[PDB]
RNA sequence: GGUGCUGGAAGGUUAAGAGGAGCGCUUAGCGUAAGCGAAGGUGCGAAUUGAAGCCCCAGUAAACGGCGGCCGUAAACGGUC
């Protein structure tokens, strides 16, 4: 989000699953079915690295 | 992919020619009536064989030939026929 950007494990139900955009479709094409190797930070900056 | 060219019969379509089943027409004669009829002669000839070629399978574009549309996103990428 431009003001509310965050990364956390949510617990509430984010409803209205509308028709997915093309970034979500490419994520389901490329990422789904895989495993997560490690979650590490690029130094001390606000950069999150996900190893899939 | 289609058409040309080259190669390949696994499988169908295959002509003429071989092949002759069988079915008509005549009658020596059996028959009260209408029909049946051997041997010949004379027409129609069904099955079975019978190559190239065609359907088919591959390659070949300095062979013939062709190289598209809609909607987004900033040539390029994404969705669909």
GROMACS .gro file of C-alpha atoms (C1' of nucleotides) in nm, chain B residues 10-78:
model
   69
   62A      C1'    1   0.116  -5.113  -4.289
   63G      C1'    2  -0.443  -5.044  -4.468
   64G      C1'    3  -0.863  -4.928  -4.845
   65U      C1'    4  -0.990  -4.774  -5.384
   66U      C1'    5  -0.834  -4.984  -5.794
   67A      C1'    6  -0.885  -5.089  -6.540
   68A      C1'    7  -0.786  -5.424  -6.933
   69G      C1'    8  -0.662  -5.931  -6.921
   70A      C1'    9  -0.724  -6.438  -6.646
   71G      C1'   10  -1.123  -6.713  -6.393
   72G      C1'   11  -1.580  -6.936  -6.399
   73A      C1'   12  -2.005  -7.011  -5.992
   74G      C1'   13  -2.484  -6.917  -6.110
   75C      C1'   14  -2.925  -6.723  -6.391
   76G      C1'   15  -3.218  -6.657  -6.872
   77C      C1'   16  -3.361  -6.857  -7.440
   78U      C1'   17  -3.425  -7.293  -7.731
   79U      C1'   18  -3.571  -7.885  -7.696
   80A      C1'   19  -3.456  -8.535  -7.737
   81G      C1'   20  -3.833  -8.644  -7.397
   82C      C1'   21  -4.167  -8.683  -6.945
   83G      C1'   22  -4.695  -8.443  -6.908
   84U      C1'   23  -5.528  -8.504  -6.897
   85A      C1'   24  -5.487  -7.976  -6.810
   86A      C1'   25  -4.971  -7.586  -6.729
   87G      C1'   26  -4.542  -7.692  -6.689
   88C      C1'   27  -4.073  -7.968  -6.587
   89G      C1'   28  -3.670  -8.069  -6.855
   90A      C1'   29  -3.061  -8.428  -7.006
   91A      C1'   30  -2.650  -8.321  -7.401
   92G      C1'   31  -2.518  -7.904  -7.715
   93G      C1'   32  -2.558  -7.399  -7.906
   94U      C1'   33  -2.642  -6.887  -7.759
   95G      C1'   34  -2.657  -6.400  -7.387
   96C      C1'   35  -2.591  -6.196  -6.891
   97G      C1'   36  -2.134  -6.294  -6.650
   98A      C1'   37  -2.096  -6.310  -5.919
   99A      C1'   38  -1.700  -6.457  -5.589
  100U      C1'   39  -1.119  -6.482  -5.642
  101U      C1'   40  -0.669  -6.267  -5.878
  102G      C1'   41  -0.512  -5.824  -6.140
  103A      C1'   42   0.046  -5.241  -6.172
  104A      C1'   43   0.119  -4.744  -6.180
  105G      C1'   44  -0.225  -4.369  -5.984
  106C      C1'   45  -0.561  -4.169  -5.560
  107C      C1'   46  -0.660  -4.149  -4.986
  108C      C1'   47  -0.223  -4.173  -4.625
  109C      C1'   48   0.281  -4.107  -4.391
  110A      C1'   49   0.785  -3.810  -4.369
  111G      C1'   50   1.138  -3.445  -4.571
  112U      C1'   51   1.202  -3.029  -4.902
  113A      C1'   52   1.067  -2.286  -4.905
  114A      C1'   53   1.766  -1.926  -5.328
  115A      C1'   54   0.997  -2.469  -5.461
  116C      C1'   55   0.454  -2.248  -5.554
  117G      C1'   56   0.324  -1.953  -5.136
  118G      C1'   57   0.226  -1.698  -4.663
  119C      C1'   58   0.423  -1.411  -4.227
  120G      C1'   59  -0.343  -1.212  -3.850
  121G      C1'   60  -0.706  -0.982  -3.553
  122C      C1'   61  -0.940  -0.739  -3.040
  123C      C1'   62  -0.828  -0.541  -2.485
  124G      C1'   63  -0.469  -0.361  -2.160
  125U      C1'   64   0.024  -0.227  -2.006
  126A      C1'   65   0.458   0.105  -2.052
  127A      C1'   66   0.928  -0.174  -2.942
  128A      C1'   67   0.852  -0.520  -2.531
  129C      C1'   68   0.504  -0.791  -2.216
  130G      C1'   69   0.010  -1.010  -2.031
   0.00000   0.00000   0.00000
